[PDB]
Subunit: 221 residues, 6 copies
Amino acid sequence: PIVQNLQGQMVHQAISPRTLNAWVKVVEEKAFSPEVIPMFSALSEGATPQDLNTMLNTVGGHQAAMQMLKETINEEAAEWDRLHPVHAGPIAPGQMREPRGSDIAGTTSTLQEQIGWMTHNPPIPVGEIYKRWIILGLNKIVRMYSPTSILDIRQGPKEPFRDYVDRFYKTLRAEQASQEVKNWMTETLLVQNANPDCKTILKALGPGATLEEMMTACQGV
Amino acid sequence: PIVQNLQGQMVHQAISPRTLNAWVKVVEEKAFSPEVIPMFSALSEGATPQDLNTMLNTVGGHQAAMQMLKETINEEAAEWDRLHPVHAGPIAPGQMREPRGSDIAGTTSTLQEQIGWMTHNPPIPVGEIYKRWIILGLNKIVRMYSPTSILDIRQGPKEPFRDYVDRFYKTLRAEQASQEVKNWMTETLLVQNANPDCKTILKALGPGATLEEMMTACQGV
Amino acid sequence: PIVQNLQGQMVHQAISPRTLNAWVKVVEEKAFSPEVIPMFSALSEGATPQDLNTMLNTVGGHQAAMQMLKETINEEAAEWDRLHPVHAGPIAPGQMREPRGSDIAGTTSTLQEQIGWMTHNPPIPVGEIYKRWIILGLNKIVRMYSPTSILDIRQGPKEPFRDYVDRFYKTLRAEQASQEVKNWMTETLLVQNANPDCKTILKALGPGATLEEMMTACQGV
Amino acid sequence: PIVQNLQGQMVHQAISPRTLNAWVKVVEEKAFSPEVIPMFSALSEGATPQDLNTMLNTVGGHQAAMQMLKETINEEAAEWDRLHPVHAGPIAPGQMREPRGSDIAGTTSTLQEQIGWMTHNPPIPVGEIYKRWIILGLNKIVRMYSPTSILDIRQGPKEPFRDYVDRFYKTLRAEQASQEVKNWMTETLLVQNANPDCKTILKALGPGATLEEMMTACQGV
Amino acid sequence: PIVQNLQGQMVHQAISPRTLNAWVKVVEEKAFSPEVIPMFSALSEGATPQDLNTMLNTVGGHQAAMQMLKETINEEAAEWDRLHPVHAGPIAPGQMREPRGSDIAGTTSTLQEQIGWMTHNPPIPVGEIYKRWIILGLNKIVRMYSPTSILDIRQGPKEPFRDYVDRFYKTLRAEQASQEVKNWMTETLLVQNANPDCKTILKALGPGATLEEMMTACQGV
Amino acid sequence: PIVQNLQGQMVHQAISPRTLNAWVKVVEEKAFSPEVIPMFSALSEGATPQDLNTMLNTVGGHQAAMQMLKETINEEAAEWDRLHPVHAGPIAPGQMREPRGSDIAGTTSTLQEQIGWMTHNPPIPVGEIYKRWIILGLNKIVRMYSPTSILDIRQGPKEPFRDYVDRFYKTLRAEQASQEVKNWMTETLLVQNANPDCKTILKALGPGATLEEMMTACQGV
């Protein structure tokens, strides 16, 4: 990564083995779970493209997903090149070259080049551009690797509501829809797939009800 | 977090992976237990809003609680906006803007903005405002996720008093009432739900008695 | 804690997570055992009241003891206020206020106030005053939570003396009496509760005997 | 390794034991798996030849492979000497000597000599030359120690496609062919060795299809 | 301990928790074994008396030994006071007081006093004096807690010599005799308690023989 | 060890506990295996004689070997004294004394003396002299503690060649002979003790064959 030194300049320092291993261990343990994305984001703080390929290349397993991601990274990169055309005429001696999708992916650029772009004034955030592609591609994966739809979430005849509400906001946690739609899902689908005994109870709370009151309301059921 | 550097200035530094993992592990092991709140408080020392969303977003499991907290954070934020109206006229060039509930929640503010407010003179403690909302919402959770009332705490016919007194100050530990009320509970409920054989013993100690003397008094029983 | 910086001044720095966890783990493993007190003492080196409440508040379990300690801390604090009356007239602009029992307990004082008192010249050792209350209250606990009296320590008919002498200085280790009394216990009670076969042996060593010679004397028995 | 000091010069510092042990542990756990090569590459950042022989010499087990590598290192070294002849006439007093294959392998050079070449201006990247030989020899090993050919990868009659596609890009991950050939393998071999029921399904998707659509297309099969 | 700071002065710094725990763990695992003494010695590098009482007081278990040590520490301390009488007349204002046995044991001295003596010019090595008492008392313990005499070491009728020679230099490792005596034991007792079949073999090697030749000589036996 | 400080001087610093423990753990796990020697060599970087006796004295177990080593260290030391006679006349006030075998073994020298010799200009490498004696004595041990001769390595009638070739370069790894002899062993003994079915196969490869081609040639056998 590129970090600030004591002297007050930005210099490159290598990433740590127990950081590396922590990246490995996350993937081992939580596979495609959503917590992987904030986790990634923290461990990618101040990271280079080069370090990001290192992290992706050091994965073992889940090769269908790893290929889907690659192909997303190239699509997003192809899109970078499309949206940002190359600039007019020859490159100035006094200046350094604009990046392409493949420089952002780290492929066509060298480390010193990656440090030039980020440390220079203005700086360009080629990490953050790759980061969105990674996060976007992470959404693709998460959405695919979900095994059950939100409509299929229902309360058992003997299942406590509580255990059901947990299941609901876990699956709701894997839905990516607008907040307004997710509000609609909350007031609607939760009660609808609730069991008759609690359903009866919840109808008596009326509208305007909040989760602690619903959760304490269906406790004996 | 925002920490003081050797040079004698306040600069941002990233939070550590074994700090992150220690946050994870606490939640894994002690779930909704009260020790989570001092623990949180220590690990949130010098932390940003941004770091606090990172910690909340990196949770897995207990999604009913995570949703209840979110909704508490937004309520407390809505309340921030209510209580503190926006200020008169346009924002000065010489000054930086006052925060809203969503800047405190980290949502509408950027990191550099979060560092401006905290490092500037006077500084504003947007961490500590979010921290109270988190702690308040933690009380809500703790109180809900308690499974047994203090009136339901009673001593068995063969159960040592000692094991009962431990149960009492654990449940008393999940009561949040004024100290005077909790004093009333101490002198009253403890003896009342104590078993006849020890109850008899405790009546002979009279009033004014302290816990070592009660605890040594009912030892053979 | 308040530690000395490289520059040569006393500044506050936060306590470490694997220090925190080491405090937790000690309590988990050795509960009320005496080794907890030196252990505490080492891990409390340079610690604030605030850090000491953090350590006490982060306990789980042993709530009867935790309440007994609290009540000891308040008694010792009540006693601080009694012994040291408030001072004559209004507080000087040029000076900072004298502490009360509750400032020592950390309750009524702020961190910056706790740093004022300790870093200022003369410094006042409010940590060490709370530390004695903690250690005193630790003695109360240790003495209560002992399950067996020193008179009840006796040597089996088939038990090696050696295993008995170990038991003796462990229980002697939980007696807090004057050294002279503990010397009296050594020469007296040890031999008296020793088994007839070894007892016979020990009578032949005469007086003036030391532990290696007693321990080698009753080896075949 | 040779690292940059705070003062702003390149100095040698020793490699760490938990770095050493992490190298050991990788080899223990993942043997000849491809993830070993990026892993190696990260842990070899700023490393000397001397440190690279240390890492190779500290291996236990897989001695057939260790010998194959040695013999590759000597072949690649023999090739260095061939391609780069020794230079004209005697060595200048003002200059330091050009390396041979054996200096690159660390064998004929001393540490101070290895630091002369790398720290001097222009610097020569004798680490990176050995690194390619190691990576090249790692490819030789990986290719040999593969146990199954890509043509032998086929979908079971009851096996989900998904589990098969994972197997495919794992084996494709151990093929080293040009990208164009690997594209040809993707569109061709995958469908061809797919089972009749899914094969039927995939024929209906037509051409132009992408992996999420294939993977969702054969899900019920 | 008292360590040298970067500035080039000797200052006190606290001992580390995983150092503390490493001391604990050694004692847990290897009890009275001789490896405990070099181990102790390394972990006591630059240590104070105060830190040495901390280490002794934090022991759990082996209380017979802990008492024997205490009593050795006081004997060695009584001996310090005997051998070094107090000095003539009153203590000079310009000077600091000479230590007693109890200052060396850390008991009557304060930390700042322990730092005065060690940091001052000439310095006095009160650590190293206590260290010898600890090591001396460690010898007492080791010698007592040995369970078997060197004369009782003999080779089985089916036991390989090799396994016997290991037993011999382990027990020889717990003998503390002059080197000349230990040489006498080597050439004598080893062969004498060797089994008839190997004994026969060893008689054929003659005198002047070394351990690799004895060890290869009795291999088939 | 003696390490370079930030200021740019060579100063002594103590070795770390998890370094110590890593030395212990190596010995526990890999006993007399050859990987112990590079491992030793890395962990002995910048080490003193004093630290080297500490490492040897802290061993538990393998006391026959520990004695053989001691006796090798003294032999090598006796040889140092023989080869390097003491120098002419009295020692100069302006100079420091030449070392003997016992100063190299650390026995007759003090730490400050060990730092004088190493830090002084010219420096003398008393570590590296002891290091060779340790490595030499390590060869003695390794060669003795080998349990099987290279001639006894043969391929089973059902054993894959591959598993046999691994055994061969492991045992070849414990042979210390000239490279030319070891080349002779490679082309000769490997094929000779190979099974008839593969032996037949290998005869068809002719001469000039390399290990990947032999290893792929006898794969179906």
